[model samples]
Target chain A: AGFIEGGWPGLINGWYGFQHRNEEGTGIAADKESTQTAIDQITSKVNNIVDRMNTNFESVQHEFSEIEERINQLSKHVDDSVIDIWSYNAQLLVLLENEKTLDLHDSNVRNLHEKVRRMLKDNAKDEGNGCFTFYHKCDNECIEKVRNGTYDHKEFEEESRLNRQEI
Target chain B: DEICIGYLSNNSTEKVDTIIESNVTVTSSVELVENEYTGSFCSIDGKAPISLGDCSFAGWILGNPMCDDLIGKTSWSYIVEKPNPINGICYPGTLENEEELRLKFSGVLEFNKFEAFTSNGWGSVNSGAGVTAACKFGSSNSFFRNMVWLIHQSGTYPVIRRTFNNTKGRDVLMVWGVHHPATLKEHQDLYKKDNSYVAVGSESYNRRFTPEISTRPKVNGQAGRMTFYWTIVKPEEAITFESNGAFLAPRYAFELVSLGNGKLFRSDLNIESCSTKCQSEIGWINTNRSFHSVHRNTIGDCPKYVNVKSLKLATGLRNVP
Candidate 1:
């Protein structure tokens, strides 16, 4: 029954069957030690097949884990690359507050704010459009900042962060 | 020039019953206008008068979509005439030719992937000579009429601008864009198919995108609503207007008025992974926010989602005379 249950190796099953039949024929003449030895041999072979099977399963599991890790890494990279609208909105709030602090009624400020407002809204690049460079990049890259020297990074944080306050 | 004024309300069992004839003013110079087919008075311009019966009020119903009660429904309409007559319905006020004006509206709209209980009112306007016009939202008896105009023609693209008065309270404008190669037909159809689902990154990508929305609130309710506007320019405009410098142009704009007030409500759903399924459920919470106070700073909520990229900013070039 054990050999039949192992099933995959016909040679092993035949060897087990031959041993059983010989033991039965030898009857009283067969020593208990010989029977025990044969039983141990079959058990060792069975265990070896199971160990190989388990190793193959572990190999498959390892491959899946590696694939999962790659997917996670790629996902993290995408998350980093992708811009969050909430963060952008929070940054705009800061910049807007800074603009107001600098000057409440400056048309130049309003105009620059409007440009930056649009820039942020449309997600415009930091190209020749002087608006983005002024608000984001340099401390005083803007014409308004250079002329008056009122605009300062101290007014607003340079880093982007999420504002949880409800609007 | 004549100005027609009257009370218009849609709070009826039958949707189109309560609009009275007093709402329309037909001038003597123009032909007496009445659509016998539909019982509504048509506005009379000096040239030709259109039957009011044919006009459908194009604006949004403000209130919670889930709740049976609505705060109000309004449209941007011109009344009392100069050269143009405001019939109180959705009219171009003044027009040189009818072909110059076009009107489009989605029964329902999505703002920033939220089924953000807003509708769109879009169409052409008429000026005097070269035919410059504004996109307005209000009806004859609207609480407020919100209007936007193409303030500057930046390069080949046009910049649509509007200013909000923040005397009463805080207003949050949620805006996003639809790029070309994708048509309005697709947008409308998609919304119809799945009104509850928020499209994922790939699904949303350039199809419906806006870099960022202005989160700056009116501090102390005195700083007037931020002058909210967007440029219709495609690539370069997206770069210029979108703050994040990631998403493309957002031809569509929506407003959440008096957000701090309890009357109107809004919330964000967490979309953890795009790979997982995406769905948004909006819950309307009623608070003590005053519903109808002039000081509530409820600027006209005109949600205009125009695909200017595909239309080339001038696609709705119809004369409304």
Candidate 2:
């Protein structure tokens, strides 16, 4: 009766066979110890990438900061140069006014005035056509006429007045 | 053989009845009587009680012709013939003469040089070309112009009412554009699908079933009422004795085993790390539970035995609910 209920004792022992089957059926065990090793490798690689990215970001940030500072300095220098030029022109006008020999009728004074007047009139015409000709160099005609003392004082004064009116 | 546990004894029958009640209330217009004690002249025709010479004599006595009895006391009457009924004033005399009298008495009367002043009698003698034309005192045109000027002075423009279909008792989800008004068709098409609701005018549609509303408020009263009740039936669970081993045996045992295993497994992992991951996963799971939980949970459950990063990525990859 025991043999019939539990099956063959030696060839197919019931309890022993069930226990053996259960042990065999339990699939492959996972290597949990290897997980930490895998994690360490991944973490190191990620840290290296992050460090490179942070360095690149910092370098780019520094370059941009330096560029912006240089641009600001350049802007300030240009403004200072404009103020200096204005002050020089104003001082020259004051000195000429203070001197009694500043009369335009004087040949040398007249030629200098005429050269300045012609340059101013050219500048006025350029400005009238929406082209502001700033700080142009004096030409040979200006030098030659001043040397020969052939430039008219009244003509120079009238041209300067006309340029002022145009402005 | 199948055993029937429950059966419907009777079928439900829906009955609809519409009841409408209207009550009309009448309002009587008030009657106004003119004062007869104070004597006033008929300025409509040239039949002034006092003559121009008499006016001059009275002006000498009163210090000014305008201060004479007739100047302040005399009432002027005119027939208002408006082409449109809505523009017609029911109390035209009170509106015109009474308002002028009030303003004049209050010392607020500003006389425009262009306005015509009628003599004792309506004649062309002292009257210029302006006298022949009816002098508009307080007409609708003047009121409308004054109202528009007042609005302009207050830094606002008159806004014309835009008539539109009223949406009541319907769920409206408005998605407005940056620089354009929403069209009715666009609004209608937005919420026209299943489980979606829309109300155009007074009528409301929800899916294919709209509850038959018996009545609505009449004359803006609160007699009419509408209420909607909904019930949700969850998936049923069976109950059985342990000896029967029919329904509750496997269900209760499975639940208990799952609870025990869950507690033991949670205890095995680091509480702080598992809690942080669990909270994040719970948020995603709750949001997607309505539609995408089956897919997300199935994928997440497979990767539970793996590393934290893999678990996080698996959770992140799941689509939003």
Which ten contiguous residues of candidate 1 chain B have the minimum total lDDT?
B14-23
Per-model DockQ: 0.00, 0.00
Indicate the TM-score of model 2. 0.10
What candidate 1 gets wrong by more than 4 Å, as runs, is A1-167, B1-167, B174-176, B182-321
The weakest ten consecutive residues by lDDT in model 1 chain A span A15-24
> Which structure among the candidates has the greatest lDDT?
1
Question: Which residues of candidate 2, in runs, are more than 4 Å off?
Answer: A1-24, A56-167, B1-321
Query: How displaced is residue A107 in candidate 1, in Å?
Result: 91
lDDT (tens digit, per residue) of candidate 2 on B1-321: 000001011121211111121111111111111111111112222211222122221121111212222232221111111122222111111121222222222221111111111121221111111110111223311211100101111221122111112122221111100101023332123222112121112123111212222333331122222121111111132211111000000100101000010100101111121111111111212221111211111111111111111100000000111
- The CA lDDT of each predicted structure is 0.25, 0.20
Candidate 1, DockQ score (0 to 1): 0.00
